[PDB]
């Protein structure tokens, strides 16, 4: 049991103070440390996960002045690989908590990289990944959504409107919240509210059809 707690907790105790930062050794050591903790965030024992959670948090707090863009590249890579659900969640909400710290010269390429991730994470059936994405979208879009174009936004809105028919109340809540927020943090808010109303009325407008209770509840 405890051996991997001693390993990650001593890796956390070390890397906050090792060597000089921005060196060619420290970039590698920090990559391996994030890879190790995000893996330990999905290990099969309770106190191991709680210690991995406080190891990621202490290391981000310690290195924000100096390695913020590398921390966000490591968290993004764990989102990109779409793995086990606690491993994905442990990266996703942390990336969303850091999203305001990216410099304006770095928002556009993260917008382009995250839409393939958000549109894969909305296709995950597990409700805890969805409750995490429901928190992440209103923070991600408030940090990147003015850097999107209209076709990129319409791809996100389509990916969440597809979920309004779901049997899970949580999936419908995640979609209903995400779609309105994606519009709200666009460069074109009044147009996107108009487009989203045309979709939402359009989904119930042929009022004689056998619409499902699930789709009505989402809309």
């Amino acid at each position: 049991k405890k051996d991997r707690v001693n390993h990650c907790l001593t890796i956390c105790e070390n890397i906050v103070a090792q060597s000089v930062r921005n060196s060619p050794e420290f970039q590698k050591l920090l990559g391996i440390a994030m890879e190790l903790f995000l893996l330990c965030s999905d290990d099969a024992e309770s106190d191991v996960r709680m210690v991995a959670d406080e190891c990621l948090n202490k290391v981000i707090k310690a290195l924000m002045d100096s390695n913020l863009p590398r921390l966000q590249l490591e968290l993004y890579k764990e989102i990109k690989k779409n793995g086990a659900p606690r491993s994905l969640r442990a990266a996703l909400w942390r990336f969303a908590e850091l999203a305001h710290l990216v410099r304006p010269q770095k928002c556009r390429p993260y917008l382009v990289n995250l839409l393939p991730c958000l549109t894969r994470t909305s296709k995950r059936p597990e409700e805890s990944v969805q409750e995490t994405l429901a928190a992440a979208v209103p923070k991600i879009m408030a940090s990147f959504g003015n850097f999107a174009n209209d076709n990129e936004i319409k791809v996100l809105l389509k990916a969440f409107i597809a979920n309004l028919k779901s049997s899970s109340p949580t999936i419908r809540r995640t979609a209903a919240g995400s779609a309105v927020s994606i519009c709200q943090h666009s460069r074109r808010t009044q147009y996107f509210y108009s487009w989203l109303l045309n979709v939402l009325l359009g989904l119930l407008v042929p009022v004689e059809d056998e619409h499902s209770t699930l789709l009505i509840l989402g809309v």
């Binding site: 930062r21 921005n22 002045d65 100096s66």
Partner: peptide, 17 residues
């Protein structure tokens, strides 16, 4: 981190004139 770190060249000095 910063643009002196990224450009790999030094910060200046504080002095009166």
């Amino acid at each position: 981190x910063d643009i002196w770190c990224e450009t790999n060249k030094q910060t200046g000095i504080l002095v009166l004139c």
